[PDB]
């Protein structure tokens, strides 16, 4: 077949990262300027995105350079957190730096080993301004609050940033490492009140409880179980069929009935009140579920079970032919609640703990649905702060004292990579400048003097372009956990250095 | 690149032409649109307020403007075309400043900044009137109905909005007498003057021909539980293959299924509104009929309408099968009344039972569902405007023209902001001067007599007053009876800014595939 | 930014009248018209709004922009 | 007239003064390779060029931009001699800043900013990098031997520099601490060799009117003059060209030999063994010369007998308006004498001490008016080498020296003026590429490795062309002096400030 060489293989490396580079920047850092993702492709409609993901997958993938960059700064996000810029935006600012240096032509290995250790000269000069606000557990959780302050910014939210700012924190703090989410169960709904957030205590559901089984249900015993029905229950004797013919259309529509009625009988002498199935019935078998005395409440989830199952005791397990092999998580009560036109059902019996549950309101889910990946991504670098505390305070600040000094490390240390380190060093102070414009400040001064400035031992005063003003990136609380400015240097300049070692896209 | 700005640019440029395309409004203007679509299938429209959600458009942000269109009749009710002919008020401006080297970010609190003082203007032309005056409830629905559909049945709608939302007024200058709130039902028949309001809960049902309830006693419905009979729910071990025993399982489904009926009956129901789902037939015809054998009113496959009001009103769940009898969940019923006049229409009457302080339930009829739509979009922004003076207490000038008032005292805020923005705010303080004179766009010859002034006719006036858009003579532009809550016009501002603020971040290429 | 520092003087206008301090044609970082020491007669800017006001109206000055064809040739 | 807008005419500057930048960069150093001279609208005759001056003299460029590097050159190429084809190069390698910076938003206002200061940065640097060398005569001896010869590196002709060079020290050698180029009389003769080319000690003339007048003499009074003869000057001796009467045409002749005797007498009186005329003399007045003892040289060259007036204590005869009234010329020794395979007059006992003549032998003439184009720019360099005795270390070493130092002044200025101070030392990092990559080596090796070395800081290690790698510069001779550096620092950013301001151009062309 085909074999892309040299110069369009380092080009086309160039053409769909640098792109999609240049989507999700607008947005990166601080905000003076968003991103908008048209939908013409799979409706008539229109997504405001803030989310490198969103724009990378969205987007489909048919370059070898716009395959990779979404496939890694993805993943960068997926671990370090708002990593989808990370990789895509650096590696295409240095993607655009390979260019010179390919285009002037310096043998690759510079440009390879150059910013190889470049990034690290950028992560080692950064690595510097990284410091520990983990000093106490109030000023970790401050430290929480700034870093995870600084993840959730850039990203579309109203209140849910206010929510999980503390939130992230609360998360990581009492588990203690981590950031992550097993202590704090989102399930999120369309509420009422638009930017609000509260605490669920236990977990709720949906559902209206009509004809014979009572809409309440009360002193709950939480009866976890995975066996369930949909309309019928098949099992040995409940696989029958009776139909050869056009005879038995009309019987076999009756028994259908009675496989509605027969696994009523084996909870029953579990005898447990509160019987949780995933599954849902259809209302007549509700009214035989009504009759049993063991309550059927209908379609559980499992989030909500994993939430009694810390504070309760109770579990969720396998092999069940008894209530004996599952834990019982002890409820207060189980009503039936009218939200709205909609009616709800809610669990009970604990009051927060070791896990939690949180339920979203609003309009719509794009409101609610990127705040539990900002809060991912601080979880991301949550995880991130409490094994390294280190608050590197950024908005370029941090990342063009990296650009001031990787030059020191340009200049003399490297022989021909010199040229290089400059140049990564280059894309270091480069999205300070396209985030200058959008909240209109001089570039030049704050990505020339104030990089120099601030590398003076002025990397409190940075940059936060709301504004087009510099201003202290601890009072700003612009910082993360510096591991956060680690790992995307490393797969940007790598995902920049992967297509710049590729001299050949071979395509079959 | 330059994949944002021209995008962008059409951006402000496609949805400037439909929204340019928009002002002919406020009554008789331009000729009517008998409309072949871009398919070519042809259509008549008239008085654009509802054209505007009619209007099919493409193009990211020309699409966004009939989104946006709702977006004044969402919540309101009331002048649904003020955020849309204010939907190219901002793009006048986004031209010039993305072109005066102001960056779409200083463009975008523009909108703010702009939007912030200019409903802070707004209030100080709104003048506060009584949330619960019978008057600020009638002439705000009569000067809307006057402006809607009806403007004879507005003397009927008006009260009966005004008594629709006094019933369920919750006295307010904030959010009270919801539309989930106020049931409005049609029924076929009738008059609009028949069109009656009803303060009990009035279910709108297909009921099953007459000699059924229209009396009291009964236990209301909506229930999902079908009839357990032979050859329903029950096993017939009698085989088909034969015709005799092919009819011997239908006698036996038939004759059972009567009893189940009399129990329904039994449970003090003359009404059931049955799921629109089927257990296996749910209610069968043969039970549906035993059904009205009772008078007992039935329909299967009912409105999900019937469904949660009946909840919110008379507060009903579904009641189990008739030989396991009910948990009594349906709500209290007493008079259970379908009015037949001249037996159009099957109507199912609620008169007294569980209420939420709340669900007005009125009937809009007519001789057809036109004449009824006559009044119930009529009544409803009736409704609407009251609701919107519910919700805001007070009245400004209608149609567009305090805009032009705005216009004028924003470009002072142009001054007393003295920021990048206030050009901003400049360039679009004076471009809420436009609808006025371009509502007038479409009619005829000799054009321009109407344009300047309508500028000038507030900006001689001072910050005071200029004529009104809908009413016409000199005047104050506030005070007509054309007259609209402060909401509206809040509304629309804060509508508009927003849609067109996101097309300054509009920017590049990006499709979803 | 021929807006911001527009701007910058609007707000020094929406401060100070009749400014002797006014933007920079020396191109400094402070903005003084008196400490930038931006010299104009104020005749000649009297002179100059008077001469340069005056051109745009005369492109008005009869009806007739009728020309044989030729109104450059 | 069509009004240049900024990128219009910026572009217009870049494309053209750039390139003018790169076919004279193309002739930057001595391996600047050679440039076949295509001549634009005449003379396809081709020499081929080291230099790039000659381009900006042969080839004339339309782009006015352009049209500015070439005076410029020749600023260069004539005040300072050496720094040309260079002078060109900085600005277009400060272009190419501006490339980006104009079209990067930044306004050429700023761009001049920091290139204002920026300048004396790298001057400063190059301040720092001037040391006096040449502080003692044998240093200014081989001082002079550094940058004279130096001057004749890139340009085209630097074989014949050995025996050249020695020349055009020695005469500076006699200069001593007072440059007079005048008192050095320039020749260019063909005849010899080209190692056959001289210097004199006294003054010269390439003129010799023959051996009819007296060759060598002693003591002698050389009459400087514009002084006629057939010419019929002043002061009626026998009557000059006129009609007076039927026969006055007739007694022009015969009075004019008279005349033309008489002015013998008048010139002769002067008590002058020798005749020097600017102008003609005629034969009988000639040969009166000849027979007076006096040597008549006619139309003996203008600035020889300038010379001749300068060196040698000579006043010109006002033309004859001093018959007998106009200083002489005072040199005690007429030699005519054979440099090369002309016999020339040389006069010594001229007054100036100083007083040589440099007799440039052509075998042939290319390569001697190559030789004079060769000498002067060194003089040049070597007058200003006398005034400032002293070195700045060439082939990128003060270069890259000065880019570091100025790039990390952008590195602590760095507000709107490193924007310009950054793209500044940028170029002074940037010409080292040029002649390593006339060398055909990699500047990004040497270069930024030139960087390092000169990032430590440094006099010595420096590009050297003629390793083609980073050598020292310790005064090797590659060490350049202060002189041209200076020259260039502050002539070289002038045309990209100049056009800086004007991108608004108004063509009614």
Request: with cysteine; net charge neutral; glycine share 8%.
């Amino acid at each position: 077949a085909d074999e892309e060489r040299a110069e369009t293989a380092r080009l086309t490396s160039f053409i769909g990262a640098i792109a999609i580079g240049d989507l999700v920047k607008s947005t990166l850092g601080p905000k003076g300027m968003d991103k908008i993702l048209l939908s013409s492709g799979r409706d008539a409609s229109l997504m405001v995105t803030n989310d490198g993901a969103t724009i990378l997958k969205n987007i489909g993938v048919d370059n070898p350079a716009a395959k990779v960059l979404v496939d890694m700064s993805r993943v960068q996000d997926d671990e370090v957190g708002d990593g989808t810029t990370s990789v895509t935006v650096l590696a295409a600012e240095l993607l655009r730096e390979a260019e010179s240096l390919i285009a002037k032509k310096i043998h690759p290995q510079t440009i390879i080993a150059g910013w190889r250790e470049a990034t690290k000269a950028a992560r080692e000069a950064l690595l510097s301004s990284a410091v520990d606000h983990g000093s106490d557990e109030v000023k970790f959780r401050q430290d929480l609050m700034n870093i995870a302050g600084t993840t959730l910014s850039s990203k579309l939210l109203t209140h849910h940033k206010d929510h999980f700012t503390k939130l992230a924190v609360e998360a990581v703090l009492r588990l203690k490492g981590s950031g992550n989410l097993e202590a704090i169960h989102i399930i999120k709904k369309l509420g009422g009140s638009l930017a609000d957030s509260y605490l669920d205590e236990g977990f709720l559901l949906d559902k209206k409880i009509g004809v014979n089984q009572p809409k309440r249900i009360e002193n709950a015993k939480i009866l976890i179980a995975n066996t369930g029905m949909d309309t019928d229950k098949i099992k040995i004797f409940g696989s029958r069929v009776r139909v050869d013919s056009t005879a038995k259309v009309a019987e076999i529509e009756h028994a259908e009935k009675e496989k509605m009625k027969e696994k009523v009988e084996r909870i029953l002498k579990h005898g447990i009140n509160c019987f949780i199935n995933r599954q849902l019935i259809y209302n007549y078998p509700e009214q035989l579920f009504g009759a049993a005395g063991v309550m059927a409440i209908e379609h559980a989830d499992f989030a909500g079970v994993e939430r009694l199952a810390l504070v309760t005791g109770g579990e969720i397990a396998s092999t069940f032919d008894h209530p004996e092999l599952v834990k019982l998580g002890s409820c207060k009560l189980i009503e039936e609640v009218m939200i709205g036109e909609d009616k709800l059902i809610h669990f009970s019996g604990v009051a927060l703990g070791e896990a939690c549950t949180i339920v979203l309101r609003g309009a719509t889910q794009q409101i609610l649905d990127e705040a539990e990946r900002s809060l991912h991504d601080a979880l991301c670098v949550l995880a991130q702060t409490v094994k390294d505390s280190r608050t590197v305070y950024g908005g370029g600040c941090s990342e063009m004292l990296m650009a001031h000094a990787v030059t020191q490390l340009a200049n003399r240390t490297p022989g021909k990579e010199a040229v290089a380190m400059e140049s990564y060093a280059k894309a270091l102070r480069m999205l300070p400048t396209i985030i200058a414009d959008n909240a209109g400040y001089d570039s030049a001064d704050l990505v020339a003097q104030l990089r120099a400035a601030h590398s003076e031992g002025n990397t409190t005063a940075g940059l936060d372009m709301r504004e087009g003003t510099i201003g202290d990136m601890a009072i700003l609380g612009i910082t993360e956990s510096f591991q956060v400015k680690r790992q995307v240097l490393l797969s940007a300049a790598e995902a920049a250095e992967v297509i710049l070692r590729v001299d050949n896209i071979i395509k079959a | 690149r330059d994949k944002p700005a021209q995008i962008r640019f059409s951006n402000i440029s496609a949805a400037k032409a439909v929204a340019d395309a928009i002002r002919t409004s406020l009554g008789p203007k331009g000729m009517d649109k008998m409309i072949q679509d871009g398919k070519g299938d042809v259509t008549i429209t008239n008085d654009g307020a509802t054209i505007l959600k009619q209007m099919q458009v493409l193009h990211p942000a020309a699409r966004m403007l009939v989104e946006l269109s709702k977006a004044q009749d969402i919540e309101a009710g009331d002048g649904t075309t003020s955020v849309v002919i204010i939907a190219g008020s901002l793009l006048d401006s986004c031209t010039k400043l993305l072109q005066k080297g102001i960056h779409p970010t200083i463009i975008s609190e523009s909108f703010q900044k702009a939007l912030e003082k200019g409903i802070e203007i707004l209030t100080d032309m709104s003048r506060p009137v009584e949330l619960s005056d019978r008057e600020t409830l009638l002439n705000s629905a009569t000067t809307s109905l006057n402006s809607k559909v009806v403007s004879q049945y507005s003397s009927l709608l008006s009260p009966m909005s005004v008594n629709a939302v006094m019933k369920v007024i919750d006295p307010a200058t904030a959010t009270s007498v919801d539309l989930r709130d106020i049931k409005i039902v049609k029924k076929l028949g009738g008059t609009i003057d028949d069109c009656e309001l009803v303060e009990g809960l009035v279910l709108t049902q297909k009921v099953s021909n007459s000699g059924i309830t229209r009396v009291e006693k009964a236990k209301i419905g909506l229930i999902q539980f079908c009839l357990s009979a032979p050859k329903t729910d029950m096993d017939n071990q009698i085989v088909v293959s034969d015709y005799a025993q092919m009819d011997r399982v239908l006698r036996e489904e038939r004759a059972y299924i009567l009893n189940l009926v009399k129990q329904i009956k039994k449970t003090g129901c003359n009404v059931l509104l049955i799921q629109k789902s089927i257990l296996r037939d749910a209610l069968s015809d043969l039970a549906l009929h035993f059904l009205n054998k009772m008078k007992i009113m039935v329909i299967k496959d009912i409105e999900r309408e019937d469904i949660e009001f009946i909840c919110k009103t008379i507060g009903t769940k579904p009641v189990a099968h008739i030989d396991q009898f009910t948990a009594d969940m349906l709500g209290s019923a007493e008079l259970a009344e379908e009015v037949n006049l001249n037996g159009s229409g099957k109507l199912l009457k609620i008169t007294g039972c569980a209420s939420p302080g709340k669900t007005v339930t009125i009937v809009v009829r007519g001789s057809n569902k036109l004449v009824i739509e006559e009044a119930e979009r009529s009544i409803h922004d009736a409704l609407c405007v009251i609701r919107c003076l519910v919700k805001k207490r007070a009245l400004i000038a209608g149609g567009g023209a305090p805009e032009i008032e705005l216009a004028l005292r924003l470009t002072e805020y142009s001054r007393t902001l003295s920021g990048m923005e206030s050009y901003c705010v400049r360039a679009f303080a004076d471009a809420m001067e436009v609808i006025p004179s371009t509502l007038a766009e479409n009619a005829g010859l000799n054009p321009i007599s109407t344009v300047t002034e309508l500028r000038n006719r507030h900006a001689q006036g001072e910050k005071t007053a200029g004529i009104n858009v809908r009413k016409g003579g000199i005047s104050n532009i506030l005070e007509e009876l054309v007259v609209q809550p402060l909401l509206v016009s809040v509304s629309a501002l804060t509508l508009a800014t927003e849609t067109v603020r996101s097309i300054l971040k509009i920017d590049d290429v990006v499709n979803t595939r | 930014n021929p807006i911001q520092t527009m701007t910058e003087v609007r707000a020094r206008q929406v401060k100070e009248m009749n400014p002797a301090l006014g933007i920079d044609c020396l191109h400094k970082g402070t903005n003084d018209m008196k400490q930038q020491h931006v010299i104009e007669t104020l005749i000649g800017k009297k002179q100059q709004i008077s001469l340069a006001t005056q051109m745009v109206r005369m492109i008005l000055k009869i009806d007739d922009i009728r020309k044989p064809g030729e109104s450059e040739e």
